[PDB]
Enzyme design. Structure first.
Site, PDB file in Angstrom:
ATOM      1  N   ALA A   1       0.862  -1.185   0.000  1.00 39.15           N
ATOM      2  CA  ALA A   1       0.000   0.000   0.000  1.00 39.15           C
ATOM      3  C   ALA A   1       0.897   1.232   0.000  1.00 39.15           C
ATOM      4  O   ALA A   1       1.607   1.452  -0.996  1.00 39.15           O
ATOM      5  CB  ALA A   1      -0.983  -0.109   1.167  1.00 39.15           C
ATOM      6  N   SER A   2       0.907   2.048   1.051  1.00 40.75           N
ATOM      7  CA  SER A   2       1.682   3.279   1.078  1.00 40.75           C
ATOM      8  C   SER A   2       3.117   3.074   1.545  1.00 40.75           C
ATOM      9  O   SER A   2       3.902   4.028   1.519  1.00 40.75           O
ATOM     10  CB  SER A   2       0.998   4.309   1.983  1.00 40.75           C
ATOM     11  N   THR A   3       3.482   1.863   1.968  1.00 39.59           N
ATOM     12  CA  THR A   3       4.840   1.625   2.441  1.00 39.59           C
ATOM     13  C   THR A   3       5.871   1.787   1.332  1.00 39.59           C
ATOM     14  O   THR A   3       7.056   1.986   1.626  1.00 39.59           O
ATOM     15  CB  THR A   3       4.942   0.223   3.049  1.00 39.59           C
TER      16      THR A   3
END
Lengths: 492, 341
Positions: free
Chosen positions: A319-321
Site C-alpha cells: 500500500a503506502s509503504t
C-alpha cells in the site's frame, strides 16, 4: 603355435592378478573378523550388537540478549519390540492397567504397527508423566519386551511466543524420508525422529542439526547399552544466536493478543531482524509430541490459519509503504520502476533465514513483511544492501562468528542526496502536523482491513528499523500507538 | 568316453554341483527356514543345470557363426530397454559381448593389431557398456571386464596397456586438482569409502562387518540353523548372503567357498588353454575371469572395501537370472572343452 603360448602367458598373468585380489579379500576378512575379534564379545546369544544411531544435541537457539529460546528436555515414552512380545493383547491390557493407556493409544499403536517398517522400535505412549514412569519402573519385569526410554524432544519454553520464527520439529514421514534420500541425508538423520517443518528449525535445519553420531553398542535384553565399543561423538548442532530480543517479542505479542498481524522490527546498522512476530502462533509443543490427526485438522481448518507465518507466507500489498522507494527511484531516474523495485528486493526472495518464504508477485502486488524490512534497510543505508538476516552469529571454534553480509551491487550511488530526501520526507511525515503519524510520535523524547506501517526512530544514526502489518485491523488500538510503545520499549 | 558323448566336463560339473549344494544349504540358513523360498531355489538350480547341459551340446563353431546375430539382437534389445524410460537383459549382454569379441579376434591376425583391431574391439565394447551403464553402473563393469579379459588374453600389446595406464594415472591427479571441486570430490570420497557415512549407504555394510566379525572366527562361529543375528541387514538372502555365510560358518566357510570358486576358475582356464580355435581359447578365459570378478566384487562389497554395487554372489543367492547366465557360461565352456576337433 604362437597364439597358444601367448594366451597361456596372458592367462597366467590374469590368474596371478585374481590370486592377488583373493589375497586382498582374505586379508580384509582376517583383519575384520579375526584380529578384530572383539566385534562380538557377546557371552549370551540373546544380546545384539545393533549399530545404534546417536541423535545429536540439537543446537539451542539463543537471542541477542543470550537467553535460550527453544530448549531440549527429556520426554519419556513407552517402547517395546513387536517381534519379542509373548502376547500383544495381554501386554496392551497390562499397559492399560499400569499407565492408564487409552484405547485411542491402542489404535495409534496398531496404525504404526503396520506403518513403521518391521524389525524396529514402535512407540505407544507420549508425554509420559513421572508417576507413570515410576510405576513402570517398579513393575517393569512383568512385561515381555516393553521398556521406557527418554528421548530429547525439542522444548519451547516460550511456546506460542516464537513458533513461526523459531519453528517446530515434527515427525519424519515417508515424504521426508524420500526427500532426504534424494539428497542422500538419511545417514545424518537416522537417529532423529522430529525434524523441522518451518521456522529457523528448517532454514538452518542442517546448521541446527549437525552431524549425527552412531555407535556399535552390544545391547542385551530390554535394549540396554552395556558394552559400547565404537562410537563417533555426535556433532552437536551449532547454537545459532538469532538477531532477536525476546523481551521485545514478548512485549509485541502481549500488546497484540487477538489482533491477527505480524511485526518485523530490524536494526539497519547490523542487518539483523530484532523482532519477527506472527499473531496466532499455534502452540509448538503440540507438533513435537505426536500431534494427533484431530488437533492438526482443527488447526488446518482454523479460521485464524495459525499454520501461516504472516512474516513470510503473508504476502500482502505494501500500500503506502512503497512511497519512499518509488520516490528514490524517481529521483535516481529523473516500467523501469519494476526493475528498480526488483533491485531493492521486492518480487524476489529476500535471503531471510526461513526456507518457507513466499517470494510474492511483482506486477509488470504482494510483498511479505520481510520484503518491506529489506526495502527499509536499503533506504536507511543510502542504497547499501543488507539481507534481513535473523542469524546474528553461530557456534564455531571461537563459539561466535558474526553473520557476514553478502555484498551485492548497491542501488545507485551512495554519495547522492536522493536517499536523504526520502528519509527527511518520512521523518517529516512522522514529526509534522500535516503528517498522518505525527500524533503517534509527538511526545517521543528522541525523534521518530489490514493496517500496516513502517518507520525508524533514531533519525540521526538509526539503530532500529521496523515494518509491520496489522491483519484485518487486529482488535486493539490503531497500529500507530502500538508501534509507539514498541519503540518506547526498544530503547526505553 | 561317456561325458564327452554327452558333452559335459566331469570336473567342472562336480565342482559346480558341490557349490550348488553348499549354496542350497546356505540359502536354507538364510531363508528363515522358509519352505517356499527353498522350493524356488531348488527349481532355479534345476533350471540352471538344464540350461547348462543344453548349452553344452551346441558346437562351438555354431557359437562363432551365430555370435554376430546374438550380439546384434542383444544390442537391439539393450537399446530397447534403455528406451521406454522387459526382463533386464544385461545377462544376455555379458554372455554375448565376449562371444562377439572372441569371434572378431578369431577373424584377424594371431595377436591383435595395434589401433587397427584393438580399436575395433573397443568400439564394439563401447555401445554395449553405454547401454548397460545408462540404467545402472553395477552390471556395466561386469559387461566390460568380461570381454576386456578376452582382449587381454588375445595378446593385446603391452605397449598399449602401459600407455593407457600412464595416461589414466596422469589424468587422475588432474582430476584430483583441477576437477576437485568440493562436492564432486566429497561425493567421490563417499562412494569410494563405503564404511564411511554410517547410518546411510554404509549402514548395511557396517552391519555386515559386525556380522562377519561376530561368529566369523576360524573357530567356525555358530554353525547353520539360522542360529545367528542377520535380519539386521535386509535382503540377507540375495546380496549379503555372504554376510549370512560368514556369520553362520566362521572364516572356514568363507575359505571353503573361495576355494571352490578358485578351483572352478582354474579348471575353466585349464580347459581354455587347450581349446584349438582361438575363439574358444579366449571365450572360456573371459567367462572364468568374469566369474572371478563377480566373486571378488561381492566379497569386497560385504567385507566393506569396494564402493556400493549390486553384483550378486555367483550362483549362491536368490535369483534366477544370474544363476542361469553363469550356468550358460559354464555350458559354453564345456562345449568348447568337449567338442575339440
Amino acid at each position: 603355435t604362437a597364439e597358444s603360448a601367448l594366451f597361456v602367458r596372458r592367462a597366467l598373468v590374469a590368474f596371478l592378478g585374481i590370486l592377488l585380489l583373493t589375497g586382498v579379500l582374505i586379508a580384509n576378512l582376517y583383519n575384520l573378523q579375526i584380529v578384530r575379534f572383539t566385534d562380538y564379545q557377546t557371552r549370551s546369544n540373546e544380546n545384539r550388537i545393533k549399530l545404534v544411531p546417536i541423535a545429536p544435541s540439537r543446537g539451542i537457539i539463543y537471542d541477542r540478549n543470550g537467553i535460550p529460546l527453544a530448549l531440549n528436555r527429556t520426554i519419556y515414552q513407552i517402547e517395546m519390540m513387536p517381534e519379542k512380545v509373548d502376547n500383544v493383547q495381554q501386554t496392551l491390557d497390562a499397559l492399560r492397567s499400569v499407565v492408564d493407556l487409552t484405547d485411542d493409544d491402542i489404535a495409534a499403536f496398531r496404525k504404526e504397527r503396520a506403518r513403521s517398517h518391521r524389525f524396529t522400535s514402535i512407540p505407544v505412549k507420549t508425554n509420559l508423566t513421572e508417576v507413570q514412569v515410576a510405576r513402570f519402573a517398579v513393575n517393569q519385569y512383568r512385561f515381555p519386551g516393553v521398556e521406557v526410554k527418554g528421548y530429547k524432544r525439542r522444548y519451547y519454553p516460550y511456546g506460542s511466543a516464537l513458533t513461526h520464527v523459531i519453528g517446530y520439529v515434527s515427525k519424519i514421514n515417508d515424504k521426508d524420508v524420500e526427500r532426504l534420500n534424494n539428497d542422500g541425508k538419511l545417514a545424518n538423520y537416522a537417529a532423529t525422529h522430529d525434524i523441522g517443518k518451518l521456522g529457523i528449525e528448517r532454514y538452518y535445519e542442517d546448521v541446527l542439526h549437525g552431524q549425527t553420531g552412531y555407535e556399535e553398542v552390544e545391547v542385551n535384553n530390554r535394549g540396554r547399552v552395556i558394552r559400547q565399543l565404537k562410537e563417533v561423538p555426535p556433532q552437536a548442532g551449532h547454537d545459532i544466536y538469532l538477531t532477536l530480543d525476546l523481551k521485545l517479542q514478548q512485549y509485541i505479542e502481549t500488546l497484540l493478543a487477538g489482533s491477527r498481524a505480524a511485526v518485523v522490527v530490524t536494526d539497519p546498522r547490523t542487518g539483523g531482524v530484532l523482532a519477527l512476530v506472527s499473531t496466532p502462533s499455534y502452540d509448538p509443543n503440540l507438533f513435537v509430541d505426536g500431534i494427533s490427526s484431530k488437533d492438526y485438522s482443527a488447526l488446518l481448518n482454523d479460521p485464524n490459519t495459525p499454520l501461516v507465518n504472516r512474516a513470510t507466507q503473508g504476502v500482502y500489498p505494501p500500500a503506502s509503504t512503497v512511497k519512499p522507494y518509488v520516490a528514490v527511484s524517481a529521483l535516481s531516474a529523473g516500467d523501469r520502476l519494476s526493475e528498480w523495485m526488483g533491485k531493492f528486493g521486492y518480487g524476489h526472495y529476500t535471503g531471510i533465514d526461513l526456507a518457507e518464504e513466499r517470494s510474492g508477485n511483482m506486477p509488470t502486488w504482494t510483498a511479505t513483511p520481510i520484503q518491506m524490512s529489506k526495502a527499509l534497510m536499503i533506504l536507511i543505508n543510502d542504497g547499501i544492501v543488507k539481507v534481513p538476516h535473523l542469524l546474528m552469529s553461530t557456534a564455531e571454534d571461537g563459539k561466535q562468528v558474526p553473520w557476514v553480509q553478502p555484498h551485492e551491487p548497491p542501488v545507485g550511488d551512495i554519495h547522492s542526496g536522493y536517499w536523504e530526501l526520502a528519509k527527511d520526507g518520512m521523518y517529516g511525515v512522522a514529526n509534522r502536523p500535516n503528517g498522518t503519524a505525527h500524533k503517534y510520535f509527538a511526545s517521543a523524547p528522541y525523534k521518530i482491513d489490514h493496517k500496516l506501517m513502517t518507520a525508524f526512530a533514531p533519525y540521526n544514526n538509526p539503530q532500529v528499523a521496523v515494518a509491520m502489518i496489522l491483519e484485518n485491523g487486529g482488535a486493539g488500538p490503531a497500529v500507530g500507538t502500538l508501534m509507539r510503545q514498541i519503540l518506547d520499549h526498544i530503547m526505553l | 568316453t561317456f561325458w564327452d558323448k554327452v558333452h559335459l566336463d566331469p570336473t567342472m560339473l562336480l565342482i559346480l554341483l558341490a557349490l550348488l549344494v553348499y549354496s542350497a544349504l546356505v540359502i536354507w540358513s538364510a531363508s528363515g527356514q522358509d519352505i517356499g523360498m527353498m522350493e524356488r531355489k531348488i527349481g532355479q538350480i534345476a533350471m540352471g543345470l538344464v540350461i547348462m547341459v543344453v548349452m553344452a551340446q551346441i558346437p562351438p563353431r555354431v557359437y562363432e557363426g551365430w555370435a554376430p546375430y546374438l550380439y546384434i539382437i542383444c544390442i537391439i534389445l539393450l537399446v530397447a530397454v534403455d528406451a521406454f524410460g522387459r526382463f533386464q537383459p544385461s545377462e544376455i549382454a555379458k554372455i554375448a559381448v565376449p562371444l562377439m569379441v572372441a569371434r572378431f579376434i578369431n577373424r584377424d591376425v594371431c595377436p591383435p593389431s595395434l589401433k587397427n583391431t584393438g580399436i575395433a574391439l573397443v568400439l564394439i565394447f563401447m555401445p554395449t557398456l553405454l547401454v548397460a551403464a545408462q540404467p545402472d553402473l553395477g552390471t556395466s563393469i561386469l559387461v566390460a571386464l568380461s570381454g576386456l579379459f578376452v582382449l587381454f588374453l588375445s595378446g593385446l600389446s603391452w605397449r598399449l596397456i602401459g600407455v593407457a595406464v600412464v595416461l589414466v594415472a596422469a589424468f587422475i591427479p588432474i582430476l584430483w586438482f583441477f576437477l576437485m571441486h568440493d562436492y564432486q570430490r566429497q561425493r567421490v570420497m563417499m562412494l569410494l569409502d563405503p564404511e564411511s557415512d554410517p547410518l546411510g549407504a554404509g549402514y548395511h555394510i557396517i552391519q555386515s562387518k559386525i556380522a562377519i566379525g561376530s561368529g566369523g572366527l576360524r573357530g567356525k562361529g555358530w554353525l547353520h540353523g539360522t542360529q545367528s543375528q542377520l535380519e539386521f541387514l535386509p535382503e540377507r538372502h540375495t546380496d549379503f548372503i555372504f554376510a549370512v555365510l560368514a556369520e553362520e560358518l566362521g572364516l572356514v566357510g568363507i575359505l571353503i567357498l573361495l576355494a571352490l570358486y578358485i578351483l572352478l576358475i582354474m579348471r575353466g582356464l585349464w580347459i581354455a588353454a587347450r581349446a584349438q580355435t582361438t575363439f574358444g581359447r579366449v571365450m572360456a578365459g573371459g567367462l572364468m575371469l568374469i566369474l572371478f570378478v563377480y566373486v571378488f566384487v561381492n566379497i569386497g562389497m560385504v567385507s566393506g572395501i569396494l564402493p556400493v554395487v549390486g553384483v550378486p554372489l555367483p550362483l549362491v543367492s536368490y535369483g534366477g537370472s544370474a544363476l542361469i547366465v553363469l550356468m550358460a557360461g559354464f555350458g559354453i565352456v564345456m562345449s568348447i572343452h568337449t567338442h575339440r576337433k
